[PDB]
Amino acid sequence: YKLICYYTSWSQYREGDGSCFPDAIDPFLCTHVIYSFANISNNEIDTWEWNDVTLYDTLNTLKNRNPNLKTLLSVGGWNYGSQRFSKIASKTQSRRTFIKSVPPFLRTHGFDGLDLAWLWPGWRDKRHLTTLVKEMKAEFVREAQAGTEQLLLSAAVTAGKIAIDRGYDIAQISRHLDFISLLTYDFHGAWRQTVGHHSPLFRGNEDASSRFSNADYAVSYMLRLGAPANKLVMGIPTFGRSYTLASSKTDVGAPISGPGIPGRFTKWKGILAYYEICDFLHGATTHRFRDQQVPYATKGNQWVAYDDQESVKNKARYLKNRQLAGAMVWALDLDDFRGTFCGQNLTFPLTSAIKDVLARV
Numbered sequence: 001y002k003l004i005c006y007y008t009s010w011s012q013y014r015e016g017d018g019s020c021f022p023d024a025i026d027p028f029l030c031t032h033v034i035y036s037f038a039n040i041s042n043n044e045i046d047t048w049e050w051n052d053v054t055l056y057d058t059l060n061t062l063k064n065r066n067p068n069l070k071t072l073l074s075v076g077g078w079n080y081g082s083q084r085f086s087k088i089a090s091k092t093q094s095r096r097t098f099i100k101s102v103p104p105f106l107r108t109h110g111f112d113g114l115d116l117a118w119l120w121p122g123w124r125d126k127r128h129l130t131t132l133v134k135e136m137k138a139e140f141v142r143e144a145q146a147g148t149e150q151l152l153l154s155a156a157v158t159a160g161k162i163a164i165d166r167g168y169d170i171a172q173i174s175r176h177l178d179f180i181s182l183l184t185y186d187f188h189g190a191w192r193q194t195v196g197h198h199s200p201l202f203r204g205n206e207d208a209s210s211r212f213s214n215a216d217y218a219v220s221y222m223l224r225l226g227a228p229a230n231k232l233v234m235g236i237p238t239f240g241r242s243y244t245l246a247s248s249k250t251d252v253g254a255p256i257s258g259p260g261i262p263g264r265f266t267k268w269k270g271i272l273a274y275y276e277i278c279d280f281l282h283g284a285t286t287h288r289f290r291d292q293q294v295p296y297a298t299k300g301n302q303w304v305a306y307d308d309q310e311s312v313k314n315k316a317r318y319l320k321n322r323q324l325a326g327a328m329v330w331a332l333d334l335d336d337f338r339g340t341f342c343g344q345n346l347t348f349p350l351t352s353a354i355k356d357v358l359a360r361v
């Protein structure tokens with residue numbers, strides 16, 4: 001099994017226990033840790049926050065404890081516009097400078113591969129990733145003739161029908177990537193005004209349109225597109241999405257006035273870290289959609305759509321049955337990495353649950 005576990009750079013600024021450095025990360029836990037994004041400046045990869053060079057050394061030493069543990073840097077992200085990305089891989093001047101620019105960098109810092117997080121390319125881009133990604137690997141195969149372990153190249157891909165079709169030539173980009181992470185917690189989110197679960201496993205026999213919106217379809221689709229089994233990694237949320245209810249209506253179908261308040265540690269509108277959610281559950285009403293096989297919680301005006309131990313194992317089982325390459329956990333820093341908020345003295349409750357399913361077979 002492969003268990004790619006992202007780590008986000010900025011989680012360091014969370015106050016108190018919220019704060020998480022390459023420190024709290026178990027070296028034996030996942031197989032691949034990906035430092036969440038980098039930046040680009042003067043068409044040459046570059047760091048993002050100020051002390052990255054150090055965090056790049058905190059994280060990469062975990063490998064001294066687990067010689068098999070592989071690390072990766074991701075380029076792109078939410079806070080990195082498509083425009084800047086789309087402007088780099090169409091002007092072959094800018095594309096080839098950026099390429100040549102990263103093997104050295106990744107080497108210098110001990111990263112074993114690069115992970116492209118071009119957050120959703122447009123229909124005018126499908127042609128451009130294709131060759132950006134393509135020859136990135138021509139470079140990587142070339143650098144490897146220097147007598148060293150070939151750098152790895154992977155991509156984070158959206159999981160929405162429309163989103164995939166629009167800007168991804170999966171069939172061809174699958175034969176140059178080492179693995180693909182399916183953002184399979186990409187289905188409901190923020191707000192055309194109904195309460196919904198962002199990462200459903202199955203359909204929910206209840207509504208018809210938006211079958212497209214679930215992990216099973218996303219997965220069958222990708223395989224049908226031509227993406228090999230042994231190269232698909234199914235994304236699993238370690239966080240939840242919050243919603244301020246607009247009405248005493250709580251069952252799914254209920255109105256939404258807005259985004260959910262922040263957690264005291266996470267401080268984002270509409271997002272909650274699993275550890276924050278564990279405290280939220282105290283005094284709550286827990287629910288679970290039987291077919292999508294995922295839970296949600298409500299307290300006061302707040303409505304939370306999230307994943308707990310079993311919902312995540314269930315996914316883990318699904319992943320194993322179709323014979324995928326492995327699982328992906330969005331943010332190690334959104335799990336209970338301190339393992340002090342969620343009752344059981346277990347640390348990284350969620351990411352372990354997956355591991356367990358992926359391990360006892």
Ligand SMILES: *[C@@H]1O[C@H](CO)[C@@H](O[C@@H]2O[C@H](CO)[C@@H](O)[C@H](O)[C@H]2NC(C)=O)[C@H](O)[C@H]1NC(C)=O
Binds near residue numbers: 040048
């Ligand atoms: C990412 O790299 C860019 C490269 O210029 C850094 O620069 C800013 O972005 C605009 C767009 O070109 C520039 O015109 C401004 O001069 C810059 N603004 C700032 C805040 O200095 C950018 O800072 C890098 N990103 C991070 C956060 O690491």
